């Protein structure tokens, strides 16, 4: 008879009715439901004696019902009474459901950057903050951060970082874990900057902890400010590591700007450590001193020659093996065999020699004078063009007067034959410089109207403006592509358009739609590449979704193949799921889709092997089409670097397979094609170096992404294999107590010897020497604290680290 | 040797049931729980039919590192009640197998229910069930693991709920257990849902019975989704009460169809005093409609023993003798009162006249008013005209009575040839069967 | 890390649904 009590209009009876309803909500859910219209009037009525209690019983009408939004309306009427039930079995779930309503409303407010965010219900916000306070009382950092980004409010997040005030894990690398699962960069940057500020608030701001602001925020002034503090405290030892760490972890640009801030003793040292050129020379020293390269493997491949692709395949494969070593012993042993190559493959071969000498830098340019065309043959113009391409490879990823000198050589160079590799080399050397002069010269080659030189110019145009997001550059390239009759220029330009739009994440989405919309297949291929470059190392569903539709929809096989390659580039950051998407695609009617899937599976996994990925590759090797087979052999090799027989059972079997296909004449010349190259990929740098597109910090490697994407276009263009050479990160660790001093350091991995074996648990080094060490060994390595030279930085992973001398 | 042999087979069956559930629970989700748990529940029902040694097997079920085979040897070594119920947890915590611990808690309760003490010891089993219920409450509320227990042990909780109903049947009723079930309904409102709520609610309706029909009306509002009806027998149970609610609510026409659907879903034998109750409701509601259903179509022998009254009552409905109906009502009032459909028989006493008019409507296209008076033995022609207005009622062919020479024109629907007049009539029938083509989509999804 | 795990499981469903659309689309293309 709850309705009967409501029928009499007495204020005391109004209180009696709500109290009676509270007593037996479950017994008579229908009675409240029948009177819900009357209850709603009372709940919203200020005149009602207990409108807040009526709202509390209104939530009871919805106790059987599941509507969270009605409970939020009841919270408005209840006011304090909803908050008063901070913990109450069923109501606790309903307030949590209101918290779910609150977070979605708050996320919508965060989505609006123009202001006019819809106001959160104050009563709803009050229950949420009160429960959030209970999480702080619980002291769990995870519970405290539980509504921190759900509300998308930094002020709540500051309370969550404070939590119970223990702040141990949160005041360290909690930012890295949050960044990995973070969905929006715009909200993430606010979280990242505030967390580094809290790290700065700690008496010692860890350089690794403040590194995330240094690289992800990429504010040149902020890195200059921390460097200035290091100069002010004269902490050169701490300063030396952060500058080297910045050079390895992130690209120049802002890094160049902090160098400019620093330039205008300690000042000379800080510029040198930031430049990191000496570290590259040390990496060259590590390679030249230590190379696990077997001449016999090269001889075994050399003996079986189709006399066509084999000469090119062997020269590139040896170049990968001796890259940076400068040990061109194979070239020295065979003169007639080298002479066999035609004028074009020979142009590629001189560029391959540059890959072998890519470490001495300015010293290598003096060495290249011996290989200079006047020193060698004036008649072979392609050799002259290859020499210019080799010069660019040696200075690639470095900005220097030599790059400007190459530009001067390009001005005096022949318009087509020399610029076939000369423009390509200059662009690779000037990649990311964004110099107007290099851009203008590349435009001159683009406006030469010769596609073969133009394709080289188009790739170069992308490299120099990589990540620029320059509307003028993109407009010029797209306009030329529309007006260029020759497909070869379009293909080079297509790679270039993708390179210029690098890591946009949404900036180039309109351009990506336009390229996909464009009727021309090559422009659509560029659009798939643009999806990959803009979303490189991103699991963003939007990039995957567009890629998903185009590969099925586009009839053209080349466009479908490009889409599969793009899927690998985006998923390098999360390569665990990279094989699963590929497996259905790996089996398909199109030779291109199967070949693309094998290539895609290899690139996303990269050096790491998913085991399922290695198993999937073996049937692809047995696939009838030679084009699919050639891709499978190379893809397996990319996974094989950074691997040993103990780690993976088939690592030797794939190696035996490559030798077998080269040995068998019956095997197709096209099918064997890259198996010899694949042996080079596994043996690259004597197996010392491996392909990694992701930094330990989680920053994407700009050289790694460029090399792999261009390497997929290497099938389209043979010389693009040299671009893969740049992306070969060493597994060695650099441990110097002083920048100019090499201490004797003997860190012991204490790991099984089989992982150490390269084709008793301890490790030793002498006068650190940086040498190839497995990343898994680096994870388990033990520093020599007992030794007089002990690393100041914890040697958690391989890389340049601070070292302490007693 | 003869007494040990039942113990050995039962212990081996329980060990296999535990091993299968545990192994599946360890690997995957959804397939992890209830994949064989329903089969284990029927195996448990077989164990209930096949019988203290079971408590000794229960004792120290798990300690830490898996030693179940060694534990089976220990159970044999014991061979070579309330303390036993809590003994395994007291002797050693499982240290793992959280879904198994609930199943392990369930296994002693079945022998306690089998004892049917109808005493405080049975209530102690209810207390043990409450301890098991607390583990079920914390399965997702406190433990953040997947709902293996919600997917499987909720059925164990449903068995415990039925045991709780047994304790209340021994006493009176527990609305608080239904309130606990309402808390389980809130758990159902969460990620996973169970339809055990309706069955306990049916018992709540049953407890109020004649005194309150509001609980049945509340049930109609309470009705939500759960069309999965995975038990199917549960859907029949929901249908049996839902049909009962409509029959008492005077919606006899909808009720008979619901009872027929409920009658079809009876996989369990329901041999004595069980399916007969479902049959009893269907026959009475059809008699209430006035259409006469002969008992020859089904005639289950147990339905027959309870049908000696109804069968004579069906003959009485056909006969024009009120005294025969009165003799049946007085002589066979018992048993029908036990069924609880006795009130429907009381309303049926007036309904006898309606059966005759329906027979007349099918038999005569245009019967005379005086003839209707002779057929139904109406005292006067004006009373027959009054009966004719009652005859129009609802769901019968238009009388279109002239009120003069035409008398009971009772004109039947014309052009009912499955042609244009029934074009909706014979196309709508196909739409429903064609709609059942959904079975091809549903089964195709399962692989 | 229950709040972080909720995001991780949510990511797994989002990736799977995104991939689920691709299989049906290619299967329809195969039918043609």
């Amino acid at each position: 008879g709850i309705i009967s009590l409501l029928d009499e209009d007495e204020p005391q009876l109004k209180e009696f009715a709500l109290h009676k309803l509270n007593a037996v909500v479950n017994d008579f859910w229908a009675e409240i439901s029948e009177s819900v219209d009357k209850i709603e009037v009372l709940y919203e009525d200020e005149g009602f004696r207990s409108r807040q209690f009526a709202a509390l019983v209104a939530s009871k009408v919805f106790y059987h019902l599941g509507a969270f939004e009605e409970s939020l309306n009841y919270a408005l009427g209840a006011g304090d009474l909803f908050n008063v039930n901070d913990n109450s079995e069923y109501v606790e779930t309903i307030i949590a459901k209101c918290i779910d309503h609150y977070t979605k409303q708050c996320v919508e407010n965060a989505d609006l950057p123009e202001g006019e965010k819809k106001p959160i219900d104050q009563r709803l916000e009050g229950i949420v903050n009160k429960m959030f306070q209970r999480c702080l009382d619980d002291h769990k950092y995870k519970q405290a951060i539980g509504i921190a980004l759900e509300t998308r409010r930094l002020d709540v997040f500051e309370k969550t970082i404070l939590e119970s005030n223990d702040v141990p894990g949160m005041l360290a690398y909690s930012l890295k874990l949050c960044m990995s699962l973070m969905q929006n960069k715009q909200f993430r940057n606010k979280v990242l900057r505030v967390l580094v500020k809290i790290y700065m608030n700690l008496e010692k701001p860890d350089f690794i902890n403040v590194c995330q602001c240094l690289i992800f925020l990429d504010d040149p002034q902020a890195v200059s400010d921390i460097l200035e503090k290091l100069v002010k405290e004269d902490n050169l030892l701490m300063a030396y590591q952060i500058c080297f760490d910045l050079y390895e972890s992130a690209s120049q640009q802002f890094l160049s700007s902090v160098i400019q801030n620093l330039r205008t003793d300690q000042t000379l040292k800080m510029i040198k450590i930031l430049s990191g050129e000496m570290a590259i020379e040390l990496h060259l020293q590590f390679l030249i001193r230590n190379n696990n390269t077997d001449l016999m493997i090269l001889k075994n491949t050399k003996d079986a020659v189709r006399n066509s692709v084999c000469h090119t395949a062997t020269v590139i494969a040896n170049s990968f093996m001796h890259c940076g070593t400068t040990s061109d012993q194979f070239l020295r042993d065979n003169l007639e065999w080298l002479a066999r190559a035609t004028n074009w493959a020979k142009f590629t071969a001189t560029a391959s020699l540059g890959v072998i000498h890519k470490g001495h830098e300015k010293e290598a340019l003096q060495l290249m004078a011996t290989y200079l065309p006047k020193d060698t043959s004036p008649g072979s113009a392609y050799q002259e063009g290859g020499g210019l391409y080799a010069l660019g490879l040696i200075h690639a990823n470095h900005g220097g007067d030599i790059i400007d000198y190459l530009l001067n050589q390009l001005k005096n160079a022949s318009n087509d034959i020399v610029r076939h590799g000369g423009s390509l080399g200059l662009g690779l050397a000037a990649m990311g410089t964004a110099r107007q002069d290099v851009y203008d010269l590349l435009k001159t080659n683009l406006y030469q109207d010769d596609a073969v030189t133009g394709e080289a110019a188009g790739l170069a145009l992308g490299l120099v403006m990589l990540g620029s997001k320059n509307a003028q550059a993109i407009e010029d390239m797209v306009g030329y592509a529309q007006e260029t009759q020759h497909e070869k220029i379009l293909r080079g330009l297509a790679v270039g358009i993708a390179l210029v739009m690098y890591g946009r994440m949404e900036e180039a989405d309109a351009l990506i739609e336009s390229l996909c919309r464009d009727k021309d297949p090559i422009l659509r291929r560029s659009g798939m590449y643009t999806v990959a470059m803009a979303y490189c190392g991103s699991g963003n569903n939007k990039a995957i979704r567009r890629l998903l539709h185009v590969a099925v929809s586009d009839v053209n096989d080349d466009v479908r193949r490009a889409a599969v390659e793009s899927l690998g580039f985006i998923l390098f950051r999360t390569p665990e799921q990279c094989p699963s998407v590929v497996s259905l695609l790996s089996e398909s009617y199109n030779p291109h889709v199967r070949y693309g899937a094998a290539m895609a599976l290899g690139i996303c996994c990269a050096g790491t092997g998913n085991k399922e990925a290695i198993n999937l590759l073996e049937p692809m090797t047995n696939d009838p089409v030679n084009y699919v087979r050639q891709g499978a052999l190379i893809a397996s090799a990319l996974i094989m670097i950074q691997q040993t027989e103990i780690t993976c059972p088939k690592v030797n079997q794939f190696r035996q397979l490559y030798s077998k296909v080269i040995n068998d004449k019956h095997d197709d010349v096209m099918a064997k094609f890259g198996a010899i190259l694949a042996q080079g990929i596994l043996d690259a740098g004597g197996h010392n170096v491996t392909i990694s597109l992701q930094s330990r910090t989680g920053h994407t490697h700009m050289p790694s992404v460029v090399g792999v994407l261009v390497f997929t276009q290497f099938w389209f263009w043979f010389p693009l294999s040299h671009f893969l050479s740049l992306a070969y990160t060493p597994t060695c660790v650099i441990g110097l107590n002083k920048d100019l001093k090499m201490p004797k350091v003997q860190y012991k991995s204490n790991c099984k010897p089989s992982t150490f074996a390269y084709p008793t648990a301890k490790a030793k080094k002498k006068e650190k020497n940086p040498a190839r060490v497995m990343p898994a060994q680096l994870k388990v390595l033990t520093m020599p604290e007992t030794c007089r030279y002990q690393p100041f930085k914890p040697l958690s992973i391989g890389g340049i680290i601070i070292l302490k001398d007693t | 040797p003869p007494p040990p042999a039942p113990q050995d087979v039962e212990m081996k069956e329980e060990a296999a049931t535990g091993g299968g559930s545990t192994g599946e629970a360890d690997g995957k989700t959804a397939a992890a729980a209830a994949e064989h748990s329903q089969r284990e529940l029927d195996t448990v029902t077989l164990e209930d039919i096949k019988e203290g040694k079971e408590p000794r097997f229960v004792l120290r079920a798990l300690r830490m590192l898996p030693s179940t085979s060694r534990r089976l040897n220990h159970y044999v070594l014991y061979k070579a009640l309330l303390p036993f119920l809590e003994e395994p947890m007291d002797t050693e915590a499982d240290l793992q197998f959280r879904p198994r611990t609930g199943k392990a808690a369930s296994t002693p309760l079945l022998p306690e229910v089998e004892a049917y003490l109808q005493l405080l010891v049975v209530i102690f089993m209810m207390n043990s069930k409450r301890y098991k219920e607390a583990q079920k409450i914390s399965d997702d509320l406190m433990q953040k693991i997947s709902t293996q227990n919600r997917r499987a042990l909720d059925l164990v909780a449903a068995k415990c709920y039925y045991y709780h109903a047994r304790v209340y049947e021994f006493l009176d009723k527990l609305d608080v257990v239904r309130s606990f079930l309402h808390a389980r309904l809130r758990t159902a409102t969460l990620r996973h849902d169970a339809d055990g709520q309706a069955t306990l609610l049916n018992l709540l309706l049953r407890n109020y019975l004649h005194y309150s029909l509001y609980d049945q009306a509340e049930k109609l509002v309470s009705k939500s989704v759960f069309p999965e009806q995975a038990n199917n027998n549960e859907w029949a149970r929901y249908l049996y009460y839902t049909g009962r609610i409509k029959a008492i609510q005077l919606e006899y026409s909808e009720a008979r169809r619901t009872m027929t659907n409920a009658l079809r879903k009876a996989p369990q034998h329901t041999a004595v005093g069980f399916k007969q109750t479902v049959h009893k409701l269907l026959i009475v509601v059809e008699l209430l409609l006035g259409e006469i259903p002969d008992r020859l179509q089904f005639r289950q022998p147990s339905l027959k023993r309870s049908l000696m009254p109804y069968f004579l009552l069906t003959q009485a409905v056909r006969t024009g003798n009120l005294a025969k109906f009165n003799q049946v009502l007085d002589q066979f009032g018992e048993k029908f009162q036990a069924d609880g459909t006795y009130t429907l028989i009381i309303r049926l006493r007036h309904n006898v006249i309606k059966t005759g008019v329906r027979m007349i409507s099918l038999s005569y296209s245009r019967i005379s008013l005086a003839d209707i008076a002779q057929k139904l033995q109406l005292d006067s022609p004006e009373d027959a005209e009054f009966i004719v207005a009652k005859a129009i009622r609802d769901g019968v062919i238009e009388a279109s009575i002239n009120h003069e020479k035409g008398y009971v024109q009772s004109k039947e629907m014309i052009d009912i040839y499955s042609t244009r007049e029934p074009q909706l009539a014979f196309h709508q029938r196909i739409s429903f069967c064609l709609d059942i083509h959904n079975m091809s989509v549903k089964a195709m999804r399962f692989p | 890390d229950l709040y972080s795990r909720y995001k991780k499981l949510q990511q797994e469903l989002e990736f799977l649904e995104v991939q689920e659309e691709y299989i049906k689309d290619e299967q329809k293309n195969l039918k043609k």
Binding site: M131 | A30, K144 | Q10
Partner: peptide
């Protein structure tokens, strides 16, 4: 419970992967 039971709701969505396996078989 809000951020520790909502993850459990995503576990409910895991069954879609089983459907993806069934469709993958059709693709083959």
């Amino acid at each position: 419970y809000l951020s520790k039971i909502e993850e459990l709701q995503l576990i409910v969505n895991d069954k879609s992967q089983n459907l993806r396996r069934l469709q993958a078989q059709r693709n083959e």
